[PDB]
Every structure is written in C-alpha cells, then in structure tokens.
Ligand binder design. Structure first.
Ligand code: MG
Ligand code: MG
Ligand code: MG
Ligand code: MG
Ligand code: MG
Ligand code: MG
Ligand code: MG
Ligand code: MG
Ligand code: MG
Ligand code: MG
Ligand code: MG
Ligand code: MG
Ligand code: MG
Ligand code: MG
Ligand code: MG
Ligand code: MG
Ligand code: MG
Ligand code: MG
Ligand code: MG
Ligand code: MG
Ligand code: MG
Ligand code: MG
Ligand code: MG
Ligand code: MG
Ligand code: MG
Ligand code: MG
Ligand code: MG
Ligand code: MG
Ligand code: MG
Ligand code: MG
Ligand code: MG
Ligand code: MG
Ligand code: MG
Ligand code: MG
Ligand code: MG
Ligand code: MG
Ligand code: MG
Ligand code: MG
Ligand code: MG
Lengths: 193, 58, 148, 51, 203, 99
RNA sequence: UUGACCUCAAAUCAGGUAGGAGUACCCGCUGAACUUAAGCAUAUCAAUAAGCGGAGGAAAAGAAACCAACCGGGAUUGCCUUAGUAACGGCGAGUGAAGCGGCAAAAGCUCAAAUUUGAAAUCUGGUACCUUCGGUGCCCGAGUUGUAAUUUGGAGAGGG
RNA sequence: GUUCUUUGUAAAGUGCCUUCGAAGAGUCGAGUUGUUUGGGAAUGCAGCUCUAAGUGGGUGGUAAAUUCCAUCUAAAGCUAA
RNA sequence: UUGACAUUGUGAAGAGACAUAGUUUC
C-alpha cells in the first residue's frame, strides 16, 4: 500500500463520513430565499435602510493594520462628540459599541466626521402621524463608504542623512535583545559596595 | 441600615429566627454602633405589635 | 466519461487486466502507509528521505501572520507605480521630486535585492530591507524610509 | 454527492460565446445548422428597433 | 441591609459559629426524606441572588445525593472488550452531584420549572442541596415580565438538558480558547468539523 | 507609550496621535468600599479565626513569616494567596495582642 | 381558659399542572466492539452504533472573567478561508483545532448586592358589577425571614 | 389612514460642582484520581481532600521565584436573524 | 485486605515544642 514516487496524501475518511456529507444543492434556492428575505424586510422596515451605520476602525495584528475596515459600533465617546446620546443614536440607525475605546485621535475624528455627515444626510420623521413618504435608500454602507486614508504624496524631495535604514533595524533589534542583560549589569554594578 | 446610621434608640431582636444567621450579627452591630438592643422572646409577638404574623425585629 | 474508460475495453477478457496469477485482492501491502519501516521501506527512503522522526523545536499556538512578511525584489519595485504614472517618473530622475513608493500599502513586508533598477531616485518606504536592496536604492540617489 | 455541474473559466466561457456570435453571420454555418435562410436578404439580419 | 452580612458570614465555613450550625442542620436534613419540601430558603441571601423572590409561585426543595464516584454498573466488573475500557471503580460521571440533585426534584415536581440550586451541607455520605423552582402556571409568575420567560415551553425541564447554571458548567459552555471543544456545544461542533461540504461548482 | 515608528526594536510600532480614553468602572471591580470594609471587619470579630488560621499565627510567632508562607501555600491555593494571608495574620497580631 | 406563631399533616377540599406518543433535525448522559495498524495491548474505528433523560419549530449559543500584542479589535450562529496547518501520536498506523481576513444575519439587555421608612407603595385567590386574553370596588390571603418603584458597571447613586 | 379620551400638579433626556460607587463562596483556586481534547510539566469535565481575595480576581497555549505590562470582570439571568 | 484524609464531637490522665507558664498533637 505504498508504491511508486508519489506525494504522501493525508485523506481523512476513516470515520463514517458518508453520513456527514453536505452537498449544497440549495445554493440557488437559498440565494433566492435570501433575496426575498431582504425584499420582505425592506418593505416591513419603512424607508429605513436595511443596515446600520458602522464606524471606521483599524484592523488588528501586524498583517492587516495597514488597512482600515468597518467596525461594529461607535464608542460612547465618538457618539458624544457628535452631539447625541447612545440611547437616541440607536433609534437613528447608528450602531453603538460600549466595548470599543479610542486610543487614536485620527480614527476618533474620522468617526465623529462620519457621524456628522450621516446626521446631515438623513431625515428623521416626526413621532406624530404624518410620515412624509421618503423613498428608502437601501444601504448605509454604500451611501457612506469607508475608504483608505491617504498617507503621503506621489513625489517629494529625497532626504538622505546617510544612516542606512537597514542597520538602523540591525541596531534597534539589538537594543531590545540585550536590554535585559545590560539592566542586570546596572543592578550588579550599583552593588559596588 | 438604621442601626448603621445610628438612628435607632432601641432594637428588639427575636430569640427565634430559624435561619439564625439573619440576626446573630445584630448584637455585634448594635454594640459597635452604640445602639442599645434587647433579645426578646416571641418573634411572633413582635409580629402582633407590627400587624404581621412574625416580625423577627422591631 | 465511462465510455472512454478502459474497463469497457476489458469486457470479455477474464481477468479485467488484473492478471491470472496474482489477481486483484483486497490489500496485499496492508492498508495505507502500513510498513513504512518494514516491507515498504525501500520505497520510503528514496522518494521520501526524512519522513521518520523529528527535528527542531515545537511551537505551541503558533499564529501565522505573526510572521507575515511578503518579499519584493528591486527586480520589480517600479512595477508598484501604474505605468502611466511610471514612465513620467523615470525621465526627470531627480531629487526634489522623486516617487514615493509605499511598499506596505502594496502588501509587502520586506525589500530584497534581486538587481538592477535604473538610476532614477526613489523614496522607498518599507518595514524591512535587505542590506543589498538598500545600498542599490542609494546608488540611484534614493533612500529607504522605515515605516510600521 | 456525485459531481453534477462543471466549472468553466469565465474567460474561455466568453471566448466560446464570442465564437458562437461570430458564427451567426457566415450563412454557410447557419445553413449547415438547419435554419432555412436562403430566402432571407442578408446576414447578420438586422431589424427595426420598432420590433 | 441584612443580606450583605449573611453573604460575608457564610464565607467562613470553618468559623466556630457556622460549623455548629453546619453540624446541627446536617443531622436534621439527614432525618428527613431524601426529597422534602423546604419551608423557606435556609440561605435567603443565596436564593436571593440566584433569582429567588419570596412570592407565591416560588418553591424551595431540599435533596440528598450520595457522594463519590460512579461505579460502572456491569456484572461482576467484567467489561468484555479492550483493557483501556476495563475500568470499574475509578470512573467519575461528567455531571455534577448538584446536577443530579436538581434532576431528581425536577421530576418530583413535574409541573414546576427548576430555576437554580445551591449547596447547603455535606457529610461523608451525602451532599445536600436546596433547589429553587417556579410554578409557570401560577398567575403571579405568568404576569411579572421579569420571570414569565420561564413559562415558554423551550424551558421545560431545563435541568435535564443541562440549561441550569450547573448544567451549563459541566457542558463546558464559556467563551475563548480554553473551551474550543465544548462551546457551541460539543457534539454539534464535532459534527461541524466532521461534515464534508461539497459545493455545486467544486472548490 | 510613544511607539518608535519602526517595525522592530523596543517601542516598535506606528506613531499615532494618541488619546487615553475615559476609565471604565468595570476596571474598579476589586475596589474595597467603606460599606464592605465595615461588614468584613465586623464579621471577623463575630466569627473569629478558623482552625487553619490559628495554627498559622502561632506558626508565625514561633517560626516566622517564611515557614508560615510555606504552610499557607499548601493550605490555600498557592504562594501569592499565602503571601497575602500571612500578612493578613501579621496585622491580626500587631493590631490586637500589641498596640 | 382562650388566641396566635413555627413546622408537619388530611380532605372525592377550590383551581391547575406532569406522564404517553413521535424523535429527521436539537440539548445531555451512557457507551462498545468489528475495523486500521499487514501480528498486538497504547492508538484507531469513535468522544461513533446500540442503551437512558429532555425541548422546539428550530434547538443550542449569545452581549466577553473574549480575542489579541496591532495604528489593536469588540455578543452569538453559520459559510469561504485559515489548514490537512500549529499541535497530538508504539512521533507508528493515524489524528488535528484556533486567532486574524471576506461574506450571511445583525440587537440588545435584567437581576443579587441600597432606608419607600412622612407611611408594602407589590401580589394569588374569592366576590359583585363591567366595555371580559382584561378593568374596577370590597373581603380573605401572600408578604417585612422583603413583595414594588430605583440601579446593573457601558455604569450608576445621594447632595448642590 | 381616521376618530374618542389627556394620561399629569405624571414620566424621561441632557450641562456643571461635590460626595460616593454596594458588584454572586465549599465558589475561584490548589492537590490528587479518572475521562477527554490538537492542548504538548496537563484542553475541558467530574469524584475526594484543601480552600481564597478585594489597588481583588481571571486569562495572556513550557513548569518555577521575582518585577512589570496588556486584557477582561467569573462563581445569577433573558434574547430575534 | 492494609494505610491516610474526610464523616469527627466532649472530658480526664500521660507523653510531646516557642526552649519547666498553655494554644497544640498523639
Ligand atoms: Mg474529511
Ligand atoms: Mg440536505
Ligand atoms: Mg444586513
Ligand atoms: Mg401614525
Ligand atoms: Mg474519473
Ligand atoms: Mg484491451
Ligand atoms: Mg489478453
Ligand atoms: Mg492492468
Ligand atoms: Mg481469476
Ligand atoms: Mg504468486
Ligand atoms: Mg512522521
Ligand atoms: Mg407559602
Ligand atoms: Mg464492551
Ligand atoms: Mg483509557
Ligand atoms: Mg419563540
Ligand atoms: Mg477537538
Ligand atoms: Mg378537587
Ligand atoms: Mg417523553
Ligand atoms: Mg466497518
Ligand atoms: Mg489488525
Ligand atoms: Mg491483515
Ligand atoms: Mg487478530
Ligand atoms: Mg475519541
Ligand atoms: Mg478517544
Ligand atoms: Mg444512540
Ligand atoms: Mg431516549
Ligand atoms: Mg410541538
Ligand atoms: Mg430560522
Ligand atoms: Mg456586561
Ligand atoms: Mg466576535
Ligand atoms: Mg502521518
Ligand atoms: Mg479523535
Ligand atoms: Mg458578577
Ligand atoms: Mg465516558
Ligand atoms: Mg487531565
Ligand atoms: Mg507565573
Ligand atoms: Mg482592547
Ligand atoms: Mg432574572
Ligand atoms: Mg439561553
């Protein structure tokens, strides 16, 4: 049961796998049902747009942080700098998130400006009876796109202080490598009687 | 909270109260707060004067 | 499709191509990777040297993307400017106006040295450079701007 | 769970239908295909948008 | 209030006053029937923070469950199979003894719904529990928007499905990397990992 | 913090104009209180010392705060609760059978 | 002598509820061996079959004692991926998840712990009438060993 | 869409000053045993013994002691897609 | 079957340490 020169496959079908096969024969079916779902909802939902306003947010870790991406809710701080409370902003189609914090002003302002533009570009019908029929825009995400902030200019003067970049990394790497030791030698040499 | 706020001038504590825990700390509390207290026979008799079946304290 | 299969061609010949002597049985070698150290070892060393035993350190809970560092040689570099914008910059190779190439924004983590860029000055912003990659950038009168 | 549908690369898919459109001229093919076209004026056959 | 002292007092189980109490009560409980209705919470602070309220429709029940391991029943210890399965004596039973306590009363009151339970006493032979229940057909509970969720039929015999707080513990339902195997619920998440997902245009 | 601005090194990270947001109360969950300080001090002189606590302070006085910790680490969970327990006992002694 | 109280009883006492069925899917318990390893016990089959308890139209999960280590993200569920990877393993046969990223759907919250103390403000039941999925008047009853309002950490509370 | 009652000397939101800020225990946690997991000086679960704290507690995928840092807030609860 | 821990409490005599006051353990 081993022969010729062939990659070594690892195919896990030693359990009763035929029992657990899922063939999505209903792809087309469930896409229709999802289109009908959205349609039925957009009708129930009055001119309201099917989705809620979402904040700009910087994506985690080292791999994704370069990109900015839509977050969950707006951080009680950002909601407050835009001059409305949490409770009311939820009724307005703004998503609020008590868990997210602002350590970064540039993003903080982006979300307050996002809240500003949203408030301007919506109309909130009176409590009374009237309902002055307004023709739903279906998105918020499309009306209020989330775009990558521009970090620089195309061309600009070359400034070389001649410090080698690379070896500025070589050295930054080292200072952290030996930071612990060279503190122990500071401890140990303070003990000079 | 009365005893804690020193507003009580007399506290009557029952000798009953089967979860005796509800009460036992009151002698200490009344002492530390300077409130005079007394342990009264009849948790149910504390009730009658207060229009309950059993009052456990008055 | 089945009509092109060679089992259609075998109909009428007793043994289905499987031999009269040695037949087609269930699992003569055993099943799967059985015997990699015994009857199947001549095939394992030769075609799979190194299969058995360990090497090196275990790493518990090692998340790829900690190590994410796509690599881009000077071999390309300039490809990170759209060609219309690109040709404009090659001519007028200069200080005071030199193209800024954000390689992080392009999806790369390190710039290596494969070789030969023209003499146009460039401002290259990257997380990491090979030593030769940066020397070459300098020899065209550009620099590297370390970003994060 | 037998394979029922088949994936075709979008581009070659297009190449195919492009090829198929280009052959709806070429009356020899339309003729070879069935399609009684001897009695029609010209191919491609374009008709008023009023249709 | 009084409840803050009871809480702090109860955290001294080895204190001289509480282990006189512990010693007298555990004799009384052991005289009574293994399931017997409790007139009031003997820990009105504990019942209180578990959802109890003193109002018509809330029932308190006291139950004994024998301590120790589950001896795998099996005739004469004979296991008939591989030796890794040969064990009889050291096997531990994935559900808590408190889970068993809820289940046995929850059966004895079939019309009630088990809300929560709490530990009261134990000797070497028994652990003692007070189970707090609710009558879902009592109108004080059917009104009262706070508690009438218990009336919906999804909550029939929550303690037999592991939906009480203890059942949730032993089901291992908690967020994060320590609960991966049992979170969305263990057999379901197993089945997910072991399902073959075949699309129409095969990926 | 002030990130350096490079992708390795000590404070490695991108420089950003920073904020320091408003503190959450859920960060103060440990905080004592005037309410619970009183109750716990009160129940302590109600219920007194536990068996392992008596043998702990007599161990302290007659052995000291090293062998104490070593015992209380076996008794309690581990070495830090044993630290903080012996200290709680030191202040049982000092504040009482002394000053 | 009489009247309560605590706890425990009995009624063909007034009104209710539970059982059994089904069980494709769902929440749990319990639990194999054939098999694979070319033999075999650890392993595998499999946290599978059979056995037991319990729900629904979905069940369960769910507003973080989470993920992360970033310029950080932000309930749960699911799909595409992560990945046949990190890891487990007579490190043999074999096994094998998670974080990030895209998409589907989106939704949030309430108690315990607080003196209403210038007024238990709360509630089941009976009963009469009424505009009866209920309301109101009145009486038993519950309940201070705590029923309402108030507050739930994102807070929030007492003052001014 | 209409139309009858105004619920109210009721209820709710917001700015500043000040004082506070109650927050779940035979639990968390530890040892040991058994089971289970990819989880590896121990992933979860359970038995028995031990059993906390309040600038505390939990986690941070190599055991330990020391020093810091980050991140949440357990041992009670409801909830559509 | 044997040991330890738990269920496990009250006296008294005698051994046992801070090293010949009594909290403690057999
Ligand atoms: Mg598979
Ligand atoms: Mg199907
Ligand atoms: Mg949507
Ligand atoms: Mg209207
Ligand atoms: Mg084929
Ligand atoms: Mg042939
Ligand atoms: Mg032939
Ligand atoms: Mg052949
Ligand atoms: Mg033959
Ligand atoms: Mg032969
Ligand atoms: Mg190998
Ligand atoms: Mg009653
Ligand atoms: Mg068997
Ligand atoms: Mg085994
Ligand atoms: Mg429902
Ligand atoms: Mg697993
Ligand atoms: Mg009757
Ligand atoms: Mg049934
Ligand atoms: Mg088979
Ligand atoms: Mg075999
Ligand atoms: Mg064989
Ligand atoms: Mg055999
Ligand atoms: Mg298994
Ligand atoms: Mg197994
Ligand atoms: Mg079955
Ligand atoms: Mg069944
Ligand atoms: Mg039904
Ligand atoms: Mg549905
Ligand atoms: Mg919360
Ligand atoms: Mg999430
Ligand atoms: Mg392998
Ligand atoms: Mg397995
Ligand atoms: Mg809590
Ligand atoms: Mg088992
Ligand atoms: Mg284990
Ligand atoms: Mg440590
Ligand atoms: Mg964070
Ligand atoms: Mg509740
Ligand atoms: Mg639930």
């Amino acid at each position: 049961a081993i022969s010729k020169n062939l990659p070594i496959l690892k195919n896990h079908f030693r359990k009763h796998w035929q029992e657990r096969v899922k063939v999505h024969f209903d792809q087309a079916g469930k896409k229709v049902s999802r289109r009908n779902a959205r349609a039925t909802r957009a009708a129930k939902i009055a001119p309201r747009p099917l989705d809620l306003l979402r904040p700009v947010v910087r994506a985690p870790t080292v791999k994704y942080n370069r990109k900015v991406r839509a977050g969950r809710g707006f951080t009680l701080a950002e909601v407050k700098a835009a001059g409305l409370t949490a409770a009311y902003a939820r009724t307005i189609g703004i998503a609020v998130d008590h868990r997210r914090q602002n350590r970064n002003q540039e993003i903080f302002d982006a979300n307050v400006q996002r809240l500003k533009e949203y408030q301007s570009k919506i109309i909130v019908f009176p409590r009374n009876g009237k309902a002055p029929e307004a023709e739903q825009v279906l998105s918020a995400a499309a009306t209020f796109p989330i775009a990558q902030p521009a970090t620089d200019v195309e061309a600009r003067a070359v400034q070389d202080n001649g410090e080698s970049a690379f070896r500025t990394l070589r050295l930054a790497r080292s200072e952290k490598k030996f930071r612990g030791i060279r503190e122990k030698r500071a401890r140990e040499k303070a003990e000079a009687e | 909270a009365l005893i804690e706020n020193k507003k009580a001038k007399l506290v009557l504590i029952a000798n009953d109260v089967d979860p005796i825990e509800l009460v036992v700390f009151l002698p200490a509390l009344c002492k530390k707060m300077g409130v005079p207290y007394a342990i009264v026979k009849g948790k149910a008799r504390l009730g009658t004067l207060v229009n309950q079946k059993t009052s456990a304290v008055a | 499709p089945s009509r092109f299969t060679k089992t259609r061609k075998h109909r009428g010949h007793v043994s289905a191509g499987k031999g009269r002597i040695g037949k087609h049985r269930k699992h003569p070698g055993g099943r799967g990777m059985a015997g990699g150290q015994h009857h199947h070892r001549i095939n394992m060393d030769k075609y799979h040297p190194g299969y058995f035993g360990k090497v090196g350190m275990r790493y518990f809970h090692k998340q790829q993307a900690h190590f994410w560092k796509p690599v881009l040689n000077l071999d390309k570099l300039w490809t990170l400017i759209p060609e219309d914008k690109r040709d404009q910059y090659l001519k007028s190779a200069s200080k005071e106006t030199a193209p800024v190439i954000d390689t992080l924004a392009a999806g790369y983590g390190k710039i290596l040295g494969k070789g030969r860029i023209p003499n146009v000055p460039v401002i290259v912003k990257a997380r990491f450079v090979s030593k030769l990659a940066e020397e070459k950038i300098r020899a065209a009168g550009g620099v590297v701007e370390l970003i994060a | 769970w037998r394979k029922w549908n088949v994936k075709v690369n979008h581009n070659e898919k297009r190449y195919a239908t492009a090829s198929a459109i280009a052959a709806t001229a070429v009356a020899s093919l339309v003729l070879a295909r069935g399609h009684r076209v001897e009695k029609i004026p010209e191919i491609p056959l374009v008709v008023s948008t009023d249709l | 209030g009084a409840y803050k002292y009871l809480e702090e007092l109860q955290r001294k189980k080895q204190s001289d006053v509480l282990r006189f109490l512990q010693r007298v009560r555990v004799w009384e409980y052991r005289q009574k029937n293994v399931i017997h209705r409790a007139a009031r919470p003997t820990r009105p602070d504990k019942a209180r923070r578990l959802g109890y309220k003193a109002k018509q429709g809330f029932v308190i029940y006291r139950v004994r469950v024998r301590r120790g391991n589950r001896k795998r029943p099996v005739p004469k210890g004979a296991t008939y199979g591989k030796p890794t399965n040969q064990g009889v004596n050291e096997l531990k039973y994935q559900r808590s003894l408190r889970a068993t306590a809820e289940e046995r009363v929850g059966r004895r009151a079939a019309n009630l719904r088990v809300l929560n339970s709490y530990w009261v006493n134990q000797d070497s032979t028994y652990k003692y529990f007070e189970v707090i229940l609710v009558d879902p057909q009592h109108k004080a509970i059917r009104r009262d928007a706070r508690y009438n969720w218990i009336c919906d039929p999804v909550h029939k015999h929550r303690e037999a499905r592991g939906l009480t707080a203890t059942g949730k513990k032993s089901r291992g339902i908690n967020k994060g990397h320590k609960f991966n195997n049992t979170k969305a619920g263990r057999r379901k998440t197993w089945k997910r990992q072991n399902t073959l997902s075949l699309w129409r245009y095969r990926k | 913090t002030v990130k350096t601005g490079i992708a390795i090194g000590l404070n490695k990270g991108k420089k950003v104009t920073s904020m320091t947001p408003a503190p959450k109360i859920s960060y103060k969950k440990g905080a004592a209180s005037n309410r619970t300080k009183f109750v716990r001090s009160l129940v302590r002189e109600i219920a007194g010392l536990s068996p392992y606590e008596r043998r702990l302070i007599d161990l302290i006085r007659n052995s000291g705060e090293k062998r104490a910790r070593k015992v209380a680490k076996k008794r309690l969970g581990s070495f830090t609760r044993a630290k903080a327990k012996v200290e709680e006992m030191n202040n049982i002694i000092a504040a009482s059978r002394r000053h």
